[PDB]
Each structure stands twice: as C-alpha cells, then as structure tokens.
Design a protein around this ligand. Structure first.
Ligand SMILES: NC(=O)CC[C@H](NC(=O)[C@H](Cc1ccccc1)N1Cc2ccccc2C1=O)C(=O)O
Length: 172
C-alpha cells in the first residue's frame, strides 16, 4: 500500500518550483514561462503527483514546512485546471492546510480547525474501497482527520503552496 510518488511538472502552476528530485514543491517569486499543458493549474498554486489511484488502498508521507501557506491531500482527476477555482471539497480537493499559524481540514463553507500538535511529517492514506482520505501525524501514527468521499474517478495526491517561505516534500 505504500507508494513512491513524484510530482508531475506538467500539472504544476508556473509559479511553483519543483525540486530536481520531483519530491519537493515551493513557491517561486515569479511565474516560469511554461507551456499551456491541459493538466497544468494555470491560476491556483497546485501540483499533483504523476500517479493517481482508481481502486484500493494507498498511502504516502509528506514533510511539511513550519510556515504558513501549504495545503495537501488529494484531488479528483476532474478538478478544474484552468481558471481560478475555490479550494474546496465541492471543487474536488480534500486537504489539510496550514495558515494563520493553525492547521485546518479544508471543509466548506467553514474550514475545520484541528487541535493537533505541530506537524512535521504526515501520512496520507487514500482508501477508495472505504471511500476515505485520512491524515496521520507520523510520529505515533496519530489520526488527524478523515474526509469520507465517494470517489467515482481517479484520485491524485495534491499539493499546494501559496507562500514563499514554506514547502511540502514527498518523504523521504
Ligand atoms: N496552498 C493553500 O493553502 C491552498 C490555497 C491555494 N490558493 C491559491 O492558489 C490562491 C488563489 C487566489 C487567492 C486570492 C486571489 C487570487 C487567487 N493563490 C494564487 C496565487 C498565486 C501566486 C501567489 C499566491 C497565490 C495564492 O494564494 C490553492 O487554491 O491551491
């Protein structure tokens, strides 16, 4: 069930910078001049993994920056790439987020504050049989949050970074 992911550069918003190893994402100062690939998020600061899941159970781990500005989890493949989307379950993203110095599950219309400790590394567990996306703090595999979803399509690991001082990294 453990998966080895890499970030898909064709999906990445042109302001993002992906590390050479395709495991890390940060936000650059300027938009790169990149082609208008159909998979590319052209406005929101997102990138997907190159691999998505249609069935079964899979998990991966994400190292998280201490500073505000990231969100990560999963997106349905049909998430709109072109134009400005809301970052919400209805628009096809199921994510945890750090901002305002607080961790959130990005529920809508109101986000859900989590009372977890400081997070360093998070396991994401996607179960398409059960219909759930779950997040655990790695150190004691402490459950943080589950979204229950009836996924009817391929689901991709999702990352977003909208501040220059933070990052996400597929671990290790
Ligand atoms: N990482 C998260 O916490 C998930 C939110 C994230 N937010 C965005 O993409 C927002 C969208 C927006 C918000 C307000 C006005 C206009 C556009 N952007 C785009 C942008 C470009 C360059 C510098 C920063 C930003 C930024 O904040 C997401 O939707 O993936």
């Amino acid at each position: 069930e453990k998966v080895e992911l890499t970030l898909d550069p064709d999906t990445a918003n042109p302001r993002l910078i992906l590390s050479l190893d395709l495991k890390g994402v940060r936000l650059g100062e300027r938009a790169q001049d990149l082609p208008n690939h159909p998979c590319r998020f052209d406005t929101n600061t997102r990138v997907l993994a190159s691999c998505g899941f249609s069935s079964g159970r899979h998990h991966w781990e994400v190292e998280v920056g201490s500073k505000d500005g990231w969100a990560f989890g999963v997106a349905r493949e049909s998430v709109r790439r072109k134009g400005l989307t809301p970052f919400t379950p209805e628009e096809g993203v199921w994510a945890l987020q750090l901002n305002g110095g607080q961790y959130w599950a990005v529920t809508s219309p109101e986000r859900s504050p989590l009372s977890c400790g400081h997070l360093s590394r998070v396991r994401v567990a996607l179960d398409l049989e059960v219909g759930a996306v779950s997040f655990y703090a790695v150190e004691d595999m402490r459950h943080l949050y589950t979204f229950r979803v009836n996924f009817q399509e391929r689901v991709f690991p999702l990352f977003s970074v909208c501040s220059t001082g933070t990052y996400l990294r597929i671990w290790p």
